[PDB]
Amino acid sequence: SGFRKMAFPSGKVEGCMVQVTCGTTTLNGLWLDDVVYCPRHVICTSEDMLNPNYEDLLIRKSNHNFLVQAGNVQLRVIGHSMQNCVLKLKVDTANPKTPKYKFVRIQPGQTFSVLACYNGSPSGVYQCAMRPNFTIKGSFLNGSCGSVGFNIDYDCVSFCYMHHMELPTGVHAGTDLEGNFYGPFVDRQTAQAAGTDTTITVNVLAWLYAAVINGDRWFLNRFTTTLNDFNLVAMKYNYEPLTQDHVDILGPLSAQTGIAVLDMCASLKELLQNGMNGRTILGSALLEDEFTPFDVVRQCSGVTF
Amino acid sequence: SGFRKMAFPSGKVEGCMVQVTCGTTTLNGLWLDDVVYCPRHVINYEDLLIRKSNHNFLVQAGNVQLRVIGHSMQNCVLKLKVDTANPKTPKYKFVRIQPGQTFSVLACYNGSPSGVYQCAMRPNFTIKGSFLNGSCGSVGFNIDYDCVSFCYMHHMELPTGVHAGTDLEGNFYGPFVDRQTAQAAGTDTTITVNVLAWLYAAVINGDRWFLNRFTTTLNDFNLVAMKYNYEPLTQDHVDILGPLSAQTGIAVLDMCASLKELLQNGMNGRTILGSALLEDEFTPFDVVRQCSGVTF
Numbered sequence A: 001s002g003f004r005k006m007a008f009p010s011g012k013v014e015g016c017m018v019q020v021t022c023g024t025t026t027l028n029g030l031w032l033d034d035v036v037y038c039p040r041h042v043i044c045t046s047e048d049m050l051n052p053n054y055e056d057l058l059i060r061k062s063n064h065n066f067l068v069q070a071g072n073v074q075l076r077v078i079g080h081s082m083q084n085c086v087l088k089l090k091v092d093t094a095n096p097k098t099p100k101y102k103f104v105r106i107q108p109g110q111t112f113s114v115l116a117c118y119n120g121s122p123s124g125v126y127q128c129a130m131r132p133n134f135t136i137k138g139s140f141l142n143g144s145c146g147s148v149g150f151n152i153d154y155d156c157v158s159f160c161y162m163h164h165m166e167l168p169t170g171v172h173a174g175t176d177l178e179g180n181f182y183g184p185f186v187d188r189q190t191a192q193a194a195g196t197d198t199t200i201t202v203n204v205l206a207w208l209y210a211a212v213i214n215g216d217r218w219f220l221n222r223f224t225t226t227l228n229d230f231n232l233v234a235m236k237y238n239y240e241p242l243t244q245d246h247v248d249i250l251g252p253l254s255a256q257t258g259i260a261v262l263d264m265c266a267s268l269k270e271l272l273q274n275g276m277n278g279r280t281i282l283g284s285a286l287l288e289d290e291f292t293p294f295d296v297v298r299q300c301s302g303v304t305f
Numbered sequence B: 001s002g003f004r005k006m007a008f009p010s011g012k013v014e015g016c017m018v019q020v021t022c023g024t025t026t027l028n029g030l031w032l033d034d035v036v037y038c039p040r041h042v043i044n045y046e047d048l049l050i051r052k053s054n055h056n057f058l059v060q061a062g063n064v065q066l067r068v069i070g071h072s073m074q075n076c077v078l079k080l081k082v083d084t085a086n087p088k089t090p091k092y093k094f095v096r097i098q099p100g101q102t103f104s105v106l107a108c109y110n111g112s113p114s115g116v117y118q119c120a121m122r123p124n125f126t127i128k129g130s131f132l133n134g135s136c137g138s139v140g141f142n143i144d145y146d147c148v149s150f151c152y153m154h155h156m157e158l159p160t161g162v163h164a165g166t167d168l169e170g171n172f173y174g175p176f177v178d179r180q181t182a183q184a185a186g187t188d189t190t191i192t193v194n195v196l197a198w199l200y201a202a203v204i205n206g207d208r209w210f211l212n213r214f215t216t217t218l219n220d221f222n223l224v225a226m227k228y229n230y231e232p233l234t235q236d237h238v239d240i241l242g243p244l245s246a247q248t249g250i251a252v253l254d255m256c257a258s259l260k261e262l263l264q265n266g267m268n269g270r271t272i273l274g275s276a277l278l279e280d281e282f283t284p285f286d287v288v289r290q291c292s293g294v295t296f
């Protein structure tokens, strides 16, 4: 019993964190095999950030301009290249602690664990989701750039995020491990803001099924809804449109609890209209959207209470 | 910016988790040096233990079987002497925590870690964790510099869905026993010093809507707090909140008057750090560490 925001064990990722220093800038890098991946803005000064020409800044660099530190040992850089917004530093030593890994690009609504680091040293681990506006509500301070987001499936670490910047509203933006940003953001100090955020409907529904699995049914009603009528109401509360794909993905949870997806949708409609009236669902006074249908199946029991 | 419930990096603890099987029971063990620590319920425990031999205990570390060469009991924990010392043993201490203090839990099943989360020892000595059958022997810990302080070992789930366990010396937190009997968690209270710390964290992150021009005496605050099932705030708590009071410029009794108004009038459609409830599972030190960048 119980339902907590759970992160993956971070050990396999801790063994990859290194410190990258280029001139006056110091941030984090991910050491996998003989390559260290880090944000390309490590070659930038604060002035350069306004309109940086990365290609022109990088051509002026040699290998020995980059200092890589793994624990107390200095790694020697023997090559360097740029791939989108990520800098790839070829080092002389392969990481003996390299896990089985993949680089995956996630979609909004997907969750992942973040290992927050400063000076190549991990300080904390937390779970979060890629928001519909492509930002993450993280906890990052100056020096956390290069911190990574990941999932662990069996013994394989799937790297999905590298931290690059903080937006004016306090949210965070970054890239996949191939250097492609999530969202319409640039690694430039431009007037850029996160788009209006929305609630991840499929995730809220999954968490309502998790509450039913843990023995909470007070929010259920005798009503059903069409998918179209649900979306007209949901849009009014800044909820993401629920697609047929989302309904298909919610199938196993509907079968396990015996509550059809469109009947759970009718409960959500009523929850939005009424609020909770002094009640909580899984110890929360708000509707939680950072647990996917796959997270609920992973954490919750196969037997409903 | 941002404020999340953050756990310590679990790597140093992952390298210690093993699977312990004794007959029909399979739970988790903590392998430190040549000893494996696990709940004694894996087996009148003195009479049950005398009937067991070393080879009855099956210990698995990854894909390798560890050979048990000795066994002893210390309170509610079983200590299995094994043939191999753990090469991944970190610098460690066994510490007993007090209610209100927080820690990270590495939840395991079959000696394999599956997740990490942060939680607090409730005033009623239970933890609101996320544990399924097979999670017994999962451990709670803090990291300070390079030393892992083990503070909790999971034993059981109570009828309300909350969890109970021991320190690493086998002494239970709370009035619980390790057996099938009628036991329930006592009435719980809110950890006031922790709620105050989290209000200071909201001010640090730019949220001041809840502040007012008022102050309160410590006694008047406690009379109000006692009515909302809040733990009494002591002078020690006020002293511990000193650094956060100095950093934000808001006196502890000034922040207490903001909490008093939130308790009597609610939030009124407003949230604090994305929460519609007053959060009590961040200590004053957790707030300072998350808003400073302390690494391990």
Ligand SMILES: CNC(=O)CN1Cc2ccc(Cl)cc2[C@@]2(CCN(c3cncc4ccccc34)C2=O)C1
Pocket (backbone or CB within 6 Å): A041, A049, A140, A141, A142, A143, A144, A145, A164, A165, A166, A167, A172, A186, A187, A188, A189, A190, B001
């Ligand atoms: C908040 N931004 C700034 O003050 C200036 N920043 C412009 C800027 C523009 C583009 C890019 Cl790709 C990087 C950056 C910086 C690099 C570091 N960084 C940060 C990252 N994470 C969390 C932070 C928390 C506090 C302060 C800075 C943080 C940035 O946003 C710097």
Ligand SMILES: CNC(=O)CN1Cc2ccc(Cl)cc2[C@@]2(CCN(c3cncc4ccccc34)C2=O)C1
Pocket (backbone or CB within 6 Å): A001, B041, B131, B132, B133, B134, B135, B136, B155, B156, B157, B158, B177, B178, B179, B180, B181
């Ligand atoms: C809920 N408990 C029971 O039904 C009976 N339980 C008696 C019992 C008596 C003494 C002791 Cl020291 C342990 C125990 C059990 C052993 C495992 N365990 C559990 C622990 N965590 C999470 C669980 C989730 C679901 C079911 C069991 C869980 C217990 O409390 C089992």
Ligand SMILES: [Cl-]
Pocket (backbone or CB within 6 Å): A105, A106, A107, A110
């Ligand atoms: Cl995805």
